[PDB]
């Protein structure tokens, strides 16, 4: 049973705004730090059903680098109780720690995300919304994919060409996005294609242009990014291959950092 008695939740401060309402952090007293998605207008049942469907989606998954559903509260106000990633949003985390976070750590986050994404592919689940904005930090040695409902955006600057042109969404278009997500992490939480109109993004990609090597990014890691950005989706690596390749790059950097 995933139904939670409300008296066991103490609601804390607001940590962001969802499609349905504010998200709070708080504490769960079970017989635990949590996030609480709330729902402004769940007095209506059409809204309520959509909201609560987002819980069932997260219930399907069990991975150390995807946020866990703890439970739900299904009378008004209707809440979904999720695992809290204490340290918050990745982009902010990365910006604030731009000059204090080692490269091995940045690569670690890439690797961890790739294990979750390889896991989702093996569940035959296409995500569509892989971006640093949708990653969260549990601690400084652990990132996780955020809530999938909260992740829902068109994010042209992240999307694969075939997604843009023909609305093709496959694990291979997810790979393209993850490449952009990796670029973002190594760029310390800078968005891709800033100062570029969404429309010119497509033409540039067609012209052969890709996002540039982030400063201090290992060329091996950047190369791996550019393979995610093969125009032909069949020619991109599988998430399981990125996982293996990211492990070797992680271990190489750890050895360079003498650890
Ligand atoms: C960025 N995301 C959000 N989009 C919209 C509203 C809220 C969130 C954040 N959601 C979460 N956030 C956290 N941790 C967290 C965050 C933000 C701060 C803090 C903690 C402390 C703080 O100051 N800000 N832990 C769990 C969750 C979750 F997904 F399980 F519900 S996403 C799409 O869920 O990745």
UniProtKB/Swiss-Prot annotation:
Domain of life: Eukaryota
Disorder cited: Aberrant PTK2/FAK1 expression may play a role in cancer cell proliferation, migration and invasion, in tumor formation and metastasis. PTK2/FAK1 overexpression is seen in many types of cancer.
Active site: 129 (proton acceptor)
Tissue occurrence: Detected in B and T-lymphocytes. Isoform 1 and isoform 6 are detected in lung fibroblasts (at protein level). Ubiquitous. Expressed in epithelial cells (at protein level).
Gene this chain is encoded by: PTK2
Oligomer status and interactors: Interacts (via first Pro-rich region) with CAS family members (via SH3 domain), including BCAR1, BCAR3, and CASS4. Interacts with NEDD9 (via SH3 domain). Interacts with GIT1. Interacts with SORBS1. Interacts with ARHGEF28. Interacts with SHB. Part of a complex composed of THSD1, PTK2/FAK1, TLN1 and VCL. Interacts with PXN and TLN1. Interacts with STAT1. Interacts with DCC. Interacts with WASL. Interacts with ARHGEF7. Interacts with GRB2 and GRB7. Component of a complex that contains at least FER, CTTN and PTK2/FAK1. Interacts with BMX. Interacts with TGFB1I1. Interacts with STEAP4.
Protein name per the record: Focal adhesion kinase 1
Family affiliation: Belongs to the protein kinase superfamily. Tyr protein kinase family. FAK subfamily.
Residues holding ATP: 15-21, 37, 83-85
UniProt modified residues of type Phosphotyrosine: 153
Domain notes: The Pro-rich regions interact with the SH3 domain of CAS family members, such as BCAR1 and NEDD9, and with the GTPase activating protein ARHGAP26. The C-terminal region is the site of focal adhesion targeting (FAT) sequence which mediates the localization of FAK1 to focal adhesions.
Upper taxonomic lineage: Eukaryota, Metazoa, Chordata, Craniata, Vertebrata
Location of this fragment in the whole protein: 414 to 689 of 1052
Domain Protein kinase: 9-250
Function: Non-receptor protein-tyrosine kinase that plays an essential role in regulating cell migration, adhesion, spreading, reorganization of the actin cytoskeleton, formation and disassembly of focal adhesions and cell protrusions, cell cycle progression, cell proliferation and apoptosis. Required for early embryonic development and placenta development. Required for embryonic angiogenesis, normal cardiomyocyte migration and proliferation, and normal heart development.
PTM: Phosphorylated on tyrosine residues upon activation, e.g. upon integrin signaling. Sumoylated; this enhances autophosphorylation.
Location in the cell: Cell junction, Focal adhesion; Cell membrane; Cytoplasm, Perinuclear region; Cytoplasm, Cell cortex
């Amino acid at each position: 049973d995933y139904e939670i008695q409300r008296e066991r939740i103490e609601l804390g401060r607001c940590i962001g705004e969802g499609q349905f309402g504010d998200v709070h952090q708080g504490i769960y007293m079970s017989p635990l730090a949590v996030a609480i998605k709330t729902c402004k207008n769940c007095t209506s049942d059409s809204v309520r059903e959509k909201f609560l469907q987002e819980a069932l989606t997260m219930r399907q998954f069990d991975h150390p680098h995807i946020v866990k559903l703890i439970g739900v509260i299904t009378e008004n106000p209707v809440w979904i109780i999720m695992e809290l990633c204490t340290l918050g949003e990745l982009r902010s985390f990365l910006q604030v720690r731009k000059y204090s976070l080692d490269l091995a750590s940045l690569i670690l986050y890439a690797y961890q995300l790739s294990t979750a994404l390889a896991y989702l592919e093996s569940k035959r689940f296409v995500h569509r919304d892989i971006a640093a904005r949708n990653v969260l930090v549990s601690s400084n040695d652990c990132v996780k994919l955020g809530d999938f409902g909260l992740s829902r955006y068109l994010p042209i600057k992240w999307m694969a060409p075939e997604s843009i042109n023909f609305r093709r969404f496959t694990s291979a278009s997810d790979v393209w996005m993850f490449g952009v997500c990796m670029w973002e992490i190594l760029m310390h939480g800078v968005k891709p294609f800033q100062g570029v109109k969404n429309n010119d993004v497509i033409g540039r990609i067609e012209n052969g242009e890709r996002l540039p090597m982030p400063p201090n990014c290992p060329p091996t890691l950047y190369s791996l990014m550019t393979k995610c950005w093969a125009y032909d989706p069949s020619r991109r690596p599988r998430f399981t291959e990125l996982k293996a390749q990211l492990s070797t790059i992680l271990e190489e950097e750890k050895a360079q950092q003498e650890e």
